[PDB]
Amino acid sequence: GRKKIQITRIMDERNRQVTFTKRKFGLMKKAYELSVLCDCEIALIIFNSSNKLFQYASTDMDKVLLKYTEYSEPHESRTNTDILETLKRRE
Amino acid sequence: KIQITRIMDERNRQVTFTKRKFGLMKKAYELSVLCDCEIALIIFNSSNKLFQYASTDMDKVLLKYTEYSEPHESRTNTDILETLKRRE
Amino acid sequence: VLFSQAQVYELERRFKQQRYLSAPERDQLASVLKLTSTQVKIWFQNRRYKSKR
DNA sequence: AAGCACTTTCTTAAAATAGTG
DNA sequence: CACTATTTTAAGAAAGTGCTT
Numbered sequence: 001g002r003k004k005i006q007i008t009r010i011m012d013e014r015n016r017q018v019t020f021t022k023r024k025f026g027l028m029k030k031a032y033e034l035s036v037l038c039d040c041e042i043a044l045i046i047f048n049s050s051n052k053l054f055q056y057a058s059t060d061m062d063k064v065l066l067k068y069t070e071y072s073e074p075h076e077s078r079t080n081t082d083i084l085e086t087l088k089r090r091e
Numbered sequence: 092k093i094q095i096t097r098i099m100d101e102r103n104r105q106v107t108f109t110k111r112k113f114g115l116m117k118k119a120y121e122l123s124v125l126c127d128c129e130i131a132l133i134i135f136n137s138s139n140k141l142f143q144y145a146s147t148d149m150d151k152v153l154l155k156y157t158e159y160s161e162p163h164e165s166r167t168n169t170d171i172l173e174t175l176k177r178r179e
Numbered sequence: 180v181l182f183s184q185a186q187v188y189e190l191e192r193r194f195k196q197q198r199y200l201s202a203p204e205r206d207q208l209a210s211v212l213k214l215t216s217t218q219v220k221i222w223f224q225n226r227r228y229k230s231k232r
Numbered sequence: 233a234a235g236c237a238c239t240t241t242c243t244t245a246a247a248a249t250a251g252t253g
Numbered sequence: 254c255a256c257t258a259t260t261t262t263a264a265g266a267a268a269g270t271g272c273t274t
Contacts, residue, residue, distance in 0.1 A: 029175070044130070117262095228236080
């Protein structure tokens with residue numbers, strides 16, 4: 001970008017909406033690339049601040065969510081706190 | 092310069108999977124914080140192992156998903172490829 | 180630090196002729212490129228590993 | 233000794249994107 | 254909604270590890 005931004009809530013509503021639209025497509029493009037390069041089935045569910053839904057799924061959303069709900073084995077699970085801790089550990 | 096086609100070498104596929112899975116979760120985290128949104132990400136790899144990220148409680152996002160009735164943006168691999176081609 | 184474009188050019192040209200070098204080939208190639216014998220040995224090992232897709 | 237099969241540590245091209253017209 | 258200066262990502266390069274031949 002023309003300037004580095006801090007990862008903190010964008011307080012200007014207009015800038016927040018423009019950033020949301022650009023980065024949501026960028027995120028769905030990266031999900032598509034991971035799905036195809038590495039033979040992965042992915043679901044991505046996004047609610048914006050007004051609770052509108054935006055989704056990506058590699059092939060079929062309902063198939064991925066069914067596999068998710070039937071999965072009984074322990075599995076890797078990440079939250080914002082784990083992502084932040086990983087980024088900090090990279091000094 | 093990167094063609095979006097299956098990485099056929101298992102070892103190279105796994106190295107790319109590990110890098111890009113974290114890269115995707117990092118971008119999801121950034122979008123959730125910058126734009127104040129709720130995101131859930133489910134990844135099954137080629138062996139059907141499950142990797143998940145959510146910016147908030149996963150069960151609350153999935154319940155909101157299942158109750159949502161209105162028409163909404165819904166992308167898949169097929170239509171993302173078509174969008175990228177149209178940027179000729 | 181990375182090898183010069185000229186060093187990598189000569190290593191790749193030799194690799195397409197012979198995927199494995201004898202000690203005398205390796206030590207003489209190292210002398211001409213101004214690298215150590217180890218650096219040429221390891222460049223050949225890494226190049227073979229990368230050629231396996 | 234050197235090969236082999238990864239793994240680590242980086243560098244740097246390629247991709248994404250923040251501010252802009 | 255297109256452009257581009259700048260930052261970010263991830264593929265690739267030399268070296269590290271710890272075996273086997």
